[PDB]
Amino acid sequence: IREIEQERASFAFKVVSDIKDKYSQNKKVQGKYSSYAEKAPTIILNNGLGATLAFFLSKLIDDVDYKSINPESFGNAENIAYAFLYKHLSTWLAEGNGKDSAFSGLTNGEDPLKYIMEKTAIDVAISTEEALSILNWIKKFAKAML
Amino acid sequence: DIREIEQERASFAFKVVSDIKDKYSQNKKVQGKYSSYAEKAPTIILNNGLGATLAFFLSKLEKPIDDVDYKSINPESFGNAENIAYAFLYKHLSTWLAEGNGKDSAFSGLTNGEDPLKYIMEKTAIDVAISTEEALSILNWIKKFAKAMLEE
Amino acid sequence: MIEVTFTPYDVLLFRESRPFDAGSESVARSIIPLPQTVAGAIRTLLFYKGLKNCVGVGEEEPEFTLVGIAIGTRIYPLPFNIIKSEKFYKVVNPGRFLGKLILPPKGKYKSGYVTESILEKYLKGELKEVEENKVIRIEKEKRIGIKLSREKKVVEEGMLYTVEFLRIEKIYAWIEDPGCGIKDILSSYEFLTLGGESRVAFVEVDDKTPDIFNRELGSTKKALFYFSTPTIGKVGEIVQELEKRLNAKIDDYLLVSSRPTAISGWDMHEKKPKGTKFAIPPGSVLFVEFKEEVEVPPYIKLGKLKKLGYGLALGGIWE
Amino acid sequence: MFDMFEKAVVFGLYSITPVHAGSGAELSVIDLPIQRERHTGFPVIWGQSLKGVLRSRFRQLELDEKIEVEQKWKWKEKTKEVLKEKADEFIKKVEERKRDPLLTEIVFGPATDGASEHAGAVSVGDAKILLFPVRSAKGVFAFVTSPIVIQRLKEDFELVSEIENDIELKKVELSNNETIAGNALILNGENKVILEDIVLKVKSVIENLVEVLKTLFGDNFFGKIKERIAIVSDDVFKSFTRFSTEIVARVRIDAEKGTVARGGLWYEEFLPSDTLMYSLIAVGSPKKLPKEVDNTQKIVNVLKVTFNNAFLQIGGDETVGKGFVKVRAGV
Amino acid sequence: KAVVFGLYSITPVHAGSGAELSVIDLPIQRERHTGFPVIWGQSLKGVLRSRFRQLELDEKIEVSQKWKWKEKTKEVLKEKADEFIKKVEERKRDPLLTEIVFGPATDGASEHAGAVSVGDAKILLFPVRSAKGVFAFVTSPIVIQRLKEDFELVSVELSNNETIAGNALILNGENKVILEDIVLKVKSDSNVIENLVEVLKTLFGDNFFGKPIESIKERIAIVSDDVFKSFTRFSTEIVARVRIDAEKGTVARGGLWYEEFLPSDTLMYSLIAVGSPKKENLPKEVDNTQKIVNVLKVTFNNAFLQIGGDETVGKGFVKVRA
Ligand SMILES: [Mg+2]
């Protein structure tokens, strides 16, 4: 339960750094990502993980595939920040830090939203807790870097 | 290891919305109408009731609101985009209340296969209340996937 | 030779010589086990088994001979001519000045333990240094206890105490039995009390001579003697004893050592402390240049109280 | 074989308002979670939380001479009867809140100043969940429990049995999609129950459990249930206790601007009302003594009379109407 | 001879260690070398001695007759019996059998030693929250190896991502176990869990402290040494406690601290090494090791004890199998 925290922190630092790198001169994008990262756990708490992912989906389709998302191809800061947070959260649940690391995800590459629709209630609960935990780490680095 | 109804709701909602997008990929009107009607439906239910909502859809198809089984309704047999969409929405909603997401799923409906509107006009107020809440819950998920997938 | 293996159930206390009475001086710090403590544990078992002939009740020594002891995880204290330099412990060989063997200045000694294999290479003169990670320290475990009132469940006045235990995996003891039947009696026991605070160690016994006692070092003038257990007696008498037992005179010798080992103990027969004796500490090395070539023995017993496990020296060579 | 105690009393606790037995702030979406047993995830109230509540109430009652022993308990008089000479100085300590009144210190132990004098006579056990309220499609809500909870209740009865030396005082298996439930919860013509977001199949135990509840808390249930009792599997029950608690957003409003102030938005968890918990209260021989309370039985009697049918407040947020429970103390 | 004491916690346990290095104000006792939770031999012995002493004074000790310690004291110490009994009432000494078994009270320490050596209670099964089956009884290869060594003398390979677990912990078809918030993949294994249960049955009997040992088998999870150590160090209860200034109704000055607890549903074992009773002129029914062992078993088997601190706030209660 300690090594998993380090893995989360490593991922969180990486994705926030990518945000700050690509949009260094764009404070609006950085600020939007930060706000959404803070609001995200709340949306999950009050609506569940499934609905939250669906809510992100509406901010972007043919199929539910986080891989196919391209955050940089959007017009405004709101959609760019949403697409990034959505992909980050989905990537973590599906891939972790890669298959060369301790944590390689929970869903084995499957999109978390479709995963929720197919697997058991237990599978959904662990995905919910894990989602809250990674967002909690993203919030830390967001406040300190963005 | 059991599943929660929410999982079945999301699953069913994705399936019926994908079914429309598949059968009418070139028809943005049908997709746009369905999304509008899915969005409108919960508000009608809260103000006028579930029974009046199901009957409201059937009246759009000019079907006798008293002598129609949901299974007999085939959305792919209508001309205008409006009636196609209404038929789909009525079908999807009724199927959910009648059969859920399947007999071996974590939710197999509330009306035990009986037509929901006939069920409403035959059962007690408490039965209708339970079905009404469930109708709102499945429509919430239909709206979610319609908003993201269906185009205008 | 019989090999006894003690496996501590949990912790061990080999208390230093200092007052440790409830309601007064209340701190017990463990030292590295002295061989007489191990001898005492064995003698006490025989004392209770009814073999009071081999015990030596009220005597300094028993009838049998404890060859020596060693702790294990088998490890030995760093020879005192091994000096830490950065991240390495370097072996420092004897020099000569004014016709006298000396140890050249190369830094201060730092305490620690090495495996039996590292010691073997040292004794063969093939060891140059040891990486600091291969130098072991003995783990201590500090416990703080109290005494409660019988009824009120609160601490009685002044009844708090501290013990610094050792966390040791194994203690090995080697015994030469002149026919007392120690191997059979030890086999009948699963455990025994060893050291203080009524701690016990499991007992295994095997009829075997450890390989380190069977080494062939060859013949040379330049022998060294690593003391694996404390050695009691004047250096002059020990060197003279060495000359007699190997039938060879010595041109010069150098004792590389440290703080003398203070040895007293508790006399269970008379129920009072034993008299204080002073010993050459384990890890000390006696470098010897014999007048003629000698066959360096794998081990040799020197000094006083041999039967209590003292004076176990391991043979070696230097250049 | 539990000879350190001589008698025991079960403290039944029924919440009539939401309860926040807190564990402190966390860096999490739920800023202020309730107390939980970590390896089961079950909500608890630690014995030290409950003891502090019981002590404070008992103390105030003794200071106001409302304590009944055998007539009224005059602690100053009994103090003079026990401490004799140095009784006056002790009473002065109490009025200065340095020490606590005699019976209070006998039962719960001395105030922090006299901690080293003697230990408390009673052991206040952690409160554990017995019935947890869960919304139901039919019957509004259900009193939900599980085999592992029923088992822990039986084991606690074994504790009481060992303590009171009463051997006379001393099987539920369910699939995850199954339940044993009262008639009020069962959907019309389906043989199914819907609790929260889970459909459960009705299985053909409750009557016996109620009889047990009738033993500890009397013929009446806290002045009020079998029709809404639902027994579910251990893991389903566990998920309910962890995800069906009240989670509430609270704010601090700037009194001048009418808007949320900085550092004025947090989420707080509450154990729902209509939750049944219980704590085992073990009583040993007093370690400090007047004849009225010189042994275990007399101390038990005082405890029973003092707290049975009483109302207590446990946890924080008392000022916003949280933590109010009704107590039943039976042997 | 020796007696193995199995200890099963039914409430959280705080065996206090002042010397333990921790960020917690009041941490529990732990082993130096392994970092595992432990109950010191001296803590356990104190608990055992206090219980035994109370029973002796209350004439509840059985040796198959009622032990009358004052009668036995007179037929043992003879002319010195009356002054000894006086010391016992004066709490300067303990009753006869108590001092035979555990040694004299400190005043009479030098007279003779205690017959028993009370060993540390070592951890065996540590409860960890499981997504399936509520919680798992978790152990490790190093623990099993220690148990086997202690038992054999008194008479497994896992990666950090793997677990050998019983069926009740395993997600259907996924071959996974979820302990708290981490996922371990199930390693196929045939007899290791079964072997462990057999060892437990050989030491404590068919009933596992009030339940069939076969039920426990389905909820045992064997994890790697590093993972087990992690759980025993970071999954113990860390609880904030306060003191309220009732004058103000707020937390008093210096009235906040943190305390660690070993959870309930923890299994530990202590080897009680029994030597010959060392007091002079012993009564016949307790004059050797076997007789001391027998009294120990009857007195503590199926007993309930309180270990550690926080007794009055309901902590430290364990079931005993001897
Ligand atoms: Mg001692």
Side-chain angles (χ1 to χ4, degrees), chain D residues 31-51:
Chain D
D31 301 288
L32 299 175
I34 62 166
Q35 289 166 18
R36 290 181 183 277
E37 186 182 35
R38 176 160 181 155
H39 72 281
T40 63
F42 294 163
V44 292
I45 306 175
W46 299 124
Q48 59 266 18
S49 281
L50 182 57
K51 185 180 182 191

Side-chain angles (χ1 to χ4, degrees), chain A residues 4 11 15 20 31 38 43 48 52 58-59 66-67 69 75-77 84 104 106 116-117 122 126 130 133 136 145:
Chain A
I4 186 63
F11 184 84
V15 292
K20 190 173 182 180
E38 288 189 331
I43 304 177
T52 298
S58 68
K59 293 304 178 181
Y66 69 94
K67 303 166 156 64
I69 306 179
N76 41 311
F84 264 131
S104 56
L106 295 169
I116 291 178
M117 284 164 36
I122 297 173
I126 279 73
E130 189 61 41
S133 294
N136 193 71
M145 300 174 60

Side-chain angles (χ1 to χ4, degrees), chain C residues 20 196-198:
Chain C
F20 182 56
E197 302 302 77
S198 293

Side-chain angles (χ1 to χ4, degrees), chain C residues 4-24 26-48 50 53 55-62 64-85 87-95 97-105 107 109-123 125-127 129-130 132-133 135-136 138-150 152-155 157-168 170-188 190-207 209-270 272-297:
Chain C
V4 190
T5 303
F6 298 97
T7 304
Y9 173 78
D10 43 42
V11 291
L12 291 180
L13 174 64
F14 303 97
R15 199 180 93 233
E16 61 181 356
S17 182
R18 251 190 179 91
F20 182 56
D21 306 288
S24 309
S26 49
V27 183
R29 307 182 310 172
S30 184
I31 61 175
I32 298 302
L34 300 174
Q36 75 186 37
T37 311
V38 174
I42 299 163
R43 293 164 84 185
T44 290
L45 213 173
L46 302 181
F47 179 87
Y48 287 151
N53 174 86
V55 169
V57 183
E59 310 288 282
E60 278 188 331
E61 294 178 292
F64 65 90
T65 294
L66 181 59
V67 175
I69 62 171
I71 61 184
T73 64
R74 194 149 56 230
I75 60 178
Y76 299 91
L78 265 172
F80 284 115
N81 68 311
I82 301 180
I83 288 83
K84 182 173 179 297
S85 182
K87 302 181 187 300
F88 289 92
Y89 290 75
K90 301 185 185 302
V91 180
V92 177
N93 286 313
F97 185 69
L98 301 180
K100 289 185 173 182
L101 290 180
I102 61 173
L103 218 63
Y109 171 89
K110 182 182 181 63
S111 185
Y113 278 74
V114 288
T115 60
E116 189 164 81
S117 57
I118 297 294
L119 182 62
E120 284 172 341
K121 284 183 291 186
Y122 168 89
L123 298 173
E126 299 178 10
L127 185 73
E129 67 186 13
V130 187
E132 64 175 350
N133 267 10
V135 170
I136 317 177
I138 304 303
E139 296 178 340
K140 285 180 166 292
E141 186 174 310
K142 175 179 180 172
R143 300 185 179 186
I144 300 186
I146 55 185
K147 178 154 75 125
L148 298 174
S149 301
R150 174 183 295 174
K152 301 186 294 295
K153 204 195 177 180
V154 289
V155 179
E157 183 173 304
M159 290 307 184
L160 181 126
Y161 72 106
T162 297
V163 184
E164 296 181 11
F165 291 102
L166 296 180
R167 273 281 180 186
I168 299 185
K170 298 284 177 180
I171 298 176
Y172 292 88
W174 302 280
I175 303 177
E176 288 179 339
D177 189 14
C180 312
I182 294 183
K183 175 177 165 55
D184 289 323
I185 297 183
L186 289 186
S187 289
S188 63
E190 268 56 59
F191 56 84
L192 54 77
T193 38
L194 180 59
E197 302 302 77
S198 293
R199 303 297 84 201
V200 291
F202 297 112
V203 179
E204 303 173 88
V205 43
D206 203 320
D207 213 279
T209 296
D211 184 72
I212 191 168
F213 291 175
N214 287 320
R215 295 166 302 127
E216 286 190 302
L217 298 168
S219 191
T220 180
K221 294 171 60 179
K222 296 180 174 182
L224 65 87
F225 298 85
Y226 169 89
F227 300 113
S228 65
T229 60
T231 302
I232 306 173
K234 300 180 185 296
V235 174
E237 305 192 48
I238 296 171
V239 171
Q240 281 185 325
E241 175 183 2
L242 179 62
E243 285 180 321
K244 297 183 178 183
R245 297 194 180 277
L246 294 186
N247 194 22
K249 299 296 182 176
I250 293 173
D251 261 344
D252 195 26
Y253 63 92
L254 168 72
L255 177 60
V256 182
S257 193
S258 175
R259 177 181 181 179
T261 309
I263 297 173
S264 55
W266 181 263
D267 195 320
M268 290 191 73
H269 181 240
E270 305 179 25
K272 78 171 183 178
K274 304 173 180 174
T276 297
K277 331 160 196 65
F278 296 94
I280 303 172
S284 308
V285 183
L286 178 72
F287 293 96
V288 176
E289 189 179 72
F290 290 99
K291 296 189 188 300
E292 69 198 39
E293 285 189 355
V294 308
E295 188 69 42
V296 188

Side-chain angles (χ1 to χ4, degrees), chain E residues 36 140-143 158-160 223-230:
Chain E
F36 294 164
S140 82
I142 268 181
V143 176
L158 294 174
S159 66
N160 290 327
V223 304
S224 76
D225 294 327
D226 289 335
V227 167
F228 177 79
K229 183 178 181 178
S230 176

Side-chain angles (χ1 to χ4, degrees), chain D residues 94 97-151 153 155-157 159-163 165-166 172 174-177 179-189 192-200 202-206 208-210 212-213 215-218 220-224 228-253:
Chain D
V94 183
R97 288 190 178 97
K98 289 182 178 179
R99 298 292 291 257
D100 278 340
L102 181 64
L103 195 52
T104 293
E105 291 202 345
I106 287 183
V107 176
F108 299 97
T112 56
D113 260 27
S116 301
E117 292 184 12
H118 60 84
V122 301
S123 176
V124 184
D126 305 327
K128 69 212 77 177
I129 302 288
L130 183 51
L131 296 180
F132 188 91
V134 171
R135 65 184 183 189
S136 180
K138 189 172 184 63
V140 180
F141 81 100
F143 291 104
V144 187
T145 191
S146 76
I148 197 179
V149 173
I150 298 175
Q151 176 65 27
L153 182 55
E155 292 171 358
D156 281 332
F157 282 177
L159 263 73
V160 177
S161 177
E162 288 295 325
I163 295 178
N165 296 278
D166 198 342
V172 185
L174 287 172
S175 300
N176 281 325
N177 71 339
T179 185
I180 305 172
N183 289 328
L185 309 172
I186 305 181
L187 300 179
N188 298 325
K192 296 176 181 298
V193 174
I194 303 183
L195 298 183
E196 283 285 346
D197 203 42
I198 301 176
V199 185
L200 301 169
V202 177
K203 179 184 175 64
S204 303
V205 184
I206 295 183
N208 297 12
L209 177 63
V210 169
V212 172
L213 300 178
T215 296
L216 298 180
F217 312 138
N220 73 321
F221 186 74
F222 298 89
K224 307 164 195 303
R228 299 205 297 275
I229 294 187
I231 306 181
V232 306
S233 78
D234 292 335
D235 299 340
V236 171
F237 173 81
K238 172 187 162 183
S239 69
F240 286 156
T241 64
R242 292 212 297 153
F243 297 107
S244 302
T245 51
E246 305 272 6
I247 311 295
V248 191
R250 303 178 62 182
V251 297
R252 184 173 59 239
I253 297 294

